[PDB]
């Protein structure tokens, strides 16, 4: 028992069509290993200034017979600064024809995000706290836990295949692994946080140099680029020719020339001899205006986002606290086994 789900490459994010409610209201929502809550855009939501939040499906609780309004306010803030608020609820959730009943979700009535987010991380990272810092509702079974508890999948685990940079679609598989879509063997890496799907990154090879790291890296489907601590990012920037630019009182971004040569690769070395090679095409990101960001950015939180994850096949196993990785093989061939 595996559940395959198509990932829509939206550019900065990967999203899937799922349904919510007794009447199977279709939502296109970001698939996010870096958060743990599933929330949907209410049909009467007030979008954030300049945000078109109702273009990727909306949810009308009043037309679902199964919708339950829990007591309780919902609030979340993401790493990029965007936020969503609303109320906690429960309803039926349907993922490629597989339904789970009474799944706790949030009905969001105000947001600066463009669409809903299906957070599939650990339950201990659920946004169950208000802006006073107080826990306002208990930790709860999120979507992957409920899939397991209702007998849909054997293990709380899922495999991620974002597919190639130009691809319209990839695939996430709950409770399974597609053995046709990687070369070599999947190497298991120990998760190093009890809250976040981080693994130890030993080093990065770039432009013929090896840069020792030796700290955790979040493997986040819901981050567009790659983030490293300021001093390490600056060591890499020195080889790449990326230039730090102050964009706000406390925000700096690496820019790079749009016509910069993108030949070569960057190699990421993890535990147990596991190795992912990323083409340097992944390090030039086009902004609207004829400037480009470098694919690496500074942050106190280390994150390997989509521009890394496109080049790995990953089996996240939240029961075993492992993420198993191998170099991706782009192919329509498929041979899925249950995990």
């Amino acid at each position: 028992d595996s559940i395959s789900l198509s990932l829509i490459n939206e550019g900065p994010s990967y999203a899937s069509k799922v349904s919510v409610g007794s009447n199977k209201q279709q939502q296109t929502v970001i698939i996010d290993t870096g958060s743990s809550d599933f929330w949907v855009v209410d049909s009467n939501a007030q979008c954030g200034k300049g945000v078109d939040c109702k273009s990727s499906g909306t949810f009308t609780p009043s037309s679902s017979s199964s919708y339950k309004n829990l007591g309780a306010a919902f609030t979340i803030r993401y790493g990029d600064g965007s936020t969503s608020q609303g109320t906690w609820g429960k309803d039926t959730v349907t993922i490629n024809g597989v339904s789970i009943t009474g799944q706790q979700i949030a009905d969001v009535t105000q947001t600066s995000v463009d669409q809903g987010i299906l957070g599939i991380g650990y339950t201990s990272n659920e946004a169950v706290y208000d802006t006073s810092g107080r826990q306002t509702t208990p930790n709860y079974d999120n979507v992957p836990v409920t899939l397991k508890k209702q007998g849909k999948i054997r293990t709380n685990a899922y495999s991620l295949y974002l597919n190639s940079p130009s691809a319209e679609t990839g695939t996430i598989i709950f409770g399974g692994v597609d053995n046709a879509k990687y070369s070599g063997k999947l190497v298991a890496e120990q998760v190093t946080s009890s809250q976040a799907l981080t693994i130890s990154l030993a080093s990065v090879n770039l432009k013929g140099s090896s840069f020792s790291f030796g700290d955790g890296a979040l493997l986040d489907s819901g981050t567009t680029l790659t983030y490293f601590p300021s001093d390490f990012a600056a060591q890499l920037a020195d080889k790449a020719g990326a230039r730090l630019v102050q964009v706000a009182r406390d925000q700096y971004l690496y820019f790079i020339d749009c016509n910069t040569d993108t030949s070569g690769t960057t190699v990421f070395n993890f535990g147990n001899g596991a190795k992912i090679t990323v083409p340097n095409t992944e390090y030039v990101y086009q902004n609207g205006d004829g400037t480009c960001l470098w694919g690496i950015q500074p942050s106190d939180d280390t994150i390997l986002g989509d521009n890394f994850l496109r080049h790995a096949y990953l089996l996240y196993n939240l029961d075993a606290n492992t993420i198993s990785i191998a170099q991706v093989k782009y192919t329509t061939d498929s041979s899925i086994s249950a995990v």
Binding site: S35, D37, I76, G79, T223, D301, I303
Partner: peptide, 5 residues
């Protein structure tokens, strides 16, 4: 974008 800390 950057999805929760």
């Amino acid at each position: 974008v950057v999805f929760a800390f």
